[PDB]
From a paper:
The circadian clock of the cyanobacterium [name] can be reconstituted in vitro by three proteins, KaiA, KaiB and [name]. Homo-hexameric [name] displays kinase, phosphatase and [name] activities; KaiA enhances [name] phosphorylation and KaiB antagonizes KaiA. The crystal structure of [name] from [name] revealed a hexamer in the shape of a double doughnut with approximate dimensions 100×100 Å, whereby the N-terminal CI and C-terminal CII halves of subunits are joined by a 15-amino acid linker. Two phosphorylation sites (P-sites), T432 and S431 that are both located in the CII half were identified in [name].
To analyze the phosphorylation patterns of [name] P-site mutants and to visualize potential conformational variations in the vicinity of bound ATP and residues 432 and 431 at hexamer subunit interfaces, we determined crystal structures of the [name] [name] single mutants [name] (TSa), S431A (TaT), S431D (TdT), and T426N (nST) and the double mutants [name]/[name] (aSa) and S431A/T432E (Tae). b [name] mutations xyz or mutants KaiCxyz are sequentially shown in order of sites x = 426, y = 431, and z = 432 where the wild-type residue is in upper case and mutated residues are shown in lower case, i.e. Tsa or KaiCTSa, where the residue at position 426 is T, the residue at position 431 is S, and the residue at position 432 is mutated to A. The structures of the TdT, nST and aSa mutants provide further support for the conclusion that T432 is the principal phosphorylation site because it lies closest to the γ-phosphate.
Numbering used by the authors:
A (entry chain F): 14 to 519
B (entry chain A): 372 to 519
C (entry chain A): 224 to 297
D (entry chain B): 446 to 504
The structure:
């Protein structure tokens, strides 16, 4: 590695990437954030991982939270800090005030702390130190200039002692000054900012490394979630473009279609289905997933529009029994309102479910369902995410999209999730003789030849029957074509008179 | 209730933002769905004749059955038309039927089969030699069959 | 925040009625709605036909049209 | 025919039945004189009609 500073890994999923390797050793990192953002957790995970993964004893200095509490809360993620404190790998140095105290003590204690800490580091041979809520101590009665001095002194002794430190700090605004006294920013070697942005009644936590003296790192904010396993970061911009690409075809669940694509979809390929509401994207989705189960391959179906019941009532009415696909442990249906969370959360859930089930085919019925509310870029970031993780996972995928306007839609996606897609399946309503007929079209396929016609298709109990193209028609796409005819009655099987048999015999 | 009907979701969309609305729609739509209740929701599309979209708000995804009414300009006259646009579990009739309104209610008639661009609101009458070919004078090949 | 455990994030609308606080976790509602094949008339037989046998009991029906078309009638 | 003529129409009535025709009307010193419907025109509503002048059934 061509970086000038030595780093230590947090082993926190996603952080080490963003910081190009973890936290610089022998130096100190300010993790500052508003209330409830994940500061303690970060610093706690920082010591835990260092103990569980590298046998590095750790020191935890707490100024407000009680040692029992730090231990009570960490059980949220299944961590037995007590067993570690016991094995003498972790030492919690309690410097919190007393529920019956006085007033005045934040400088010589800053010298008594330094010495207390040095003692603990030396005794437990500690390599990592976390200092939670340094801010709370000057929160006795201090000004910027006093804080800068005391922070520096502390940090400077730590550096000398060799310790790799993490220091927590608070702030009141999500986008204003980095820390309270607008002084901590500049004294630290590194600065990580944790945010919890409100925006339209939802909450979005992000993690940003503002500075790392010595090496580079990923710039800007990064979405993340706190789960039962601690912080979990998605470096959506560290996602490279080196997905493997095969010439392997697979079926779509529809014979005629597969022909239309010049022999089925590519295994390694993102599929896009768009048409007006009611055209039938959801049918191809059902058909796509059932065929993965008809070949004894797993497949997930994330539904964001239909309940788990309906999906089955409708699916059955088209033939295909979803009840069985579920029992044979071959098809897994998810289901969720896009509103039940934020993209970050949703993208993870998807990622998760993809691991606990090793699919070979995934279908997201209605990207445009997830499109609800979210800004366009926040949506595209998601589409890059799902479309990306899948491409590098060899997982074939079918994505659905509902164009806000039946007939007359001048564009594939109102979102432009076009260039992100390899194959595009376009459905639409054609107005012929006072009636609404369907029309399916393989708009684009990158490695294949695919059929160029805009066929007509019927939906029966059997499923999708792909007929022929409205040759003798112009302005097709318009929604309401004009019937021009150089023929129609031309051969095909004229021979008038009695051509049929009726129910009796033939 | 076994059935519920809110005449004009579009009347509740007044003022309120769009996401606040979509949140309302998700609300009384699912609550009805789990309670087993059947509900009919009304929507007046902001523009007569030319409506390129079911709902201006785009709730045509949280719905199961879409019924569509629309004026059709016919010979200097404003006639109605009805079309079951989409039905998730059934087969439903694909015809854009015309219909009158009397004391008796709504008499659904036929489809305008000899027109073009009906969804627009200003169709284009186009029989001009219907389904009978230019051979309405049947050429004359039929001049041998009947004799003396 | 809730040091120690999980919790739904963000805002959630609530009303204060004659029965205290009433919160609606519109984001908590799950997609587990029961769905059958049972039909139900509309009050319009011709319609019921076009819908291949009436509206399903378990279903949401939306009527859209220009002013004066007749949604309030259906 | 290169002329700005009017047309009145009862678009909707919640109670009664009202007329469904788009009627041409003139204005004079006597007031509104509602004439007839452009029965033989297309896209009236649009505002720039197109007389069909259909050649009947052409015999
Ligand atoms: N098991 C868990 N699953 C999901 N979220 C959790 C879990 N445990 C805790 N959390 C979340 O993490 C947060 C805990 O924050 P944390 O204790 O790490 O420090 P903080 O919020 O940065 O600072 P402060 O000490 O001011 O609260 C809670 O607000 C909560 O939402
Ligand atoms: N059993 C059936 N028999 C005949 N036609 C059916 C049957 N089930 C569904 N259909 C037809 O298929 C359509 C259902 O649409 P589908 O579930 O395929 O998804 P979509 O149109 O892409 O999206 P959305 O359902 O959200 O509008 C109906 O509008 C209807 O015309
Ligand atoms: N007794 C009647 N006879 C004939 N036509 C009637 C009668 N009553 C109402 N109508 C017609 O039906 C229409 C009434 O519309 P309706 O009350 O059904 O609701 P809407 O069109 O959905 O919504 P809104 O009334 O707000 O415009 C009138 O515009 C009119 O043309
Ligand atoms: Mg659907
Ligand atoms: Mg009304």
């Amino acid at each position: 590695e061509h970086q000038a500073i030595a780093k230590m890994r947090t082993m926190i999923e996603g952080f080490d990437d963003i910081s190009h390797g973890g936290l610089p050793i022998g130096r100190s990192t300010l993790v500052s954030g508003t209330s409830g953002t994940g500061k303690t957790l970060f610093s706690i995970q920082f010591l835990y991982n260092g103990i569980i993964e590298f046998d590095e004893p750790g020191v935890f200095v707490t100024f407000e939270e009680t040692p029992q509490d730090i231990i009570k809360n960490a059980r949220s993620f299944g961590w037995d800090l007590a067993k570690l404190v016991d094995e003498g790998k972790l030492f919690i140095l309690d410097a919190s005030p007393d529920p019956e105290g006085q007033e005045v003590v934040g400088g010589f204690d800053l010298s008594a702390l330094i010495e207390r800490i040095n003692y603990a580091i030396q005794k437990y041979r500690a390599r990592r130190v976390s200092i939670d809520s340094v801010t709370s101590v000057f929160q006795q009665y201090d000004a910027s200039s006093v804080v800068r001095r005391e922070l520096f002194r502390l940090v400077a002794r730590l550096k000398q002692i060799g310790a790799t430190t993490v220091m927590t700090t608070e702030r009141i605004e999500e986008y204003g000054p980095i820390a309270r006294y607008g002084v901590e920013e500049f004294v630290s070697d590194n600065v990580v900012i944790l945010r919890n942005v409100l925006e339209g009644e939802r909450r979005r936590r992000t993690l940003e490394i503002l500075k790392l003296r010595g090496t580079s790192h990923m710039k800007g904010e990064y979405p993340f979630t706190i789960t039962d396993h601690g912080i979990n970061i998605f470096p959506l911009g560290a996602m490279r473009l080196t997905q493997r690409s095969s010439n392997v075809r697979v079926s779509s669940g529809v014979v005629r279609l597969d022909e239309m694509c010049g022999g089925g979809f590519f295994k390694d390929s993102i599929i896009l289905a768009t048409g007006a509401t009611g055209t039938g994207k959801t049918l191809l989705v059902s058909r796509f997933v059932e065929n993965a189960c008809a070949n004894k391959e797993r497949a997930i179906l994330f539904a964001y529009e239909e309940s788990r019941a309906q999906l089955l009532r409708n699916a059955y009415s088209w033939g295909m029994d979803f009840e069985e696909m579920e029992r044979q442990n071959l098809l897994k249906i998810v289901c969720a309102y896009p509103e039940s969370a934020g993209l970050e959360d949703h993208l993870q859930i998807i990622k998760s479910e993809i691991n606990d089930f090793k699919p070979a085919r995934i279908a997201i019925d209605s990207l445009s369902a997830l499109a609800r509310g979210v800004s366009n870029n926040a949506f595209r970031q998601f589409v890059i995410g799902v479309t990306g993780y899948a491409k590098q996972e060899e997982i074939t995928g079918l994505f659905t999209n509902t164009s806000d306007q039946f007939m007359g839609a001048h564009s594939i996606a109102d979102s432009h999730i076009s260039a992100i897609t390899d194959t595009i399946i376009l459905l639409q309503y054609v107005e012929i003789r006072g009636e609404m007929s369907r029309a399916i079209n393989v708009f684009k396929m990158r490695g294949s030849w695919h059929d160029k016609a805009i066929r007509e298709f019927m939906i029966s109990d059997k499923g999708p029957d792909i007929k022929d193209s409205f040759r003798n028609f112009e302005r097709i796409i318009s929604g309401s074509p004009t019937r021009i005819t150089v023929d129609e009655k031309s051969e095909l099987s004229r021979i008038v008179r009695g051509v049929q048999e009726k129910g009796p015999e033939s």
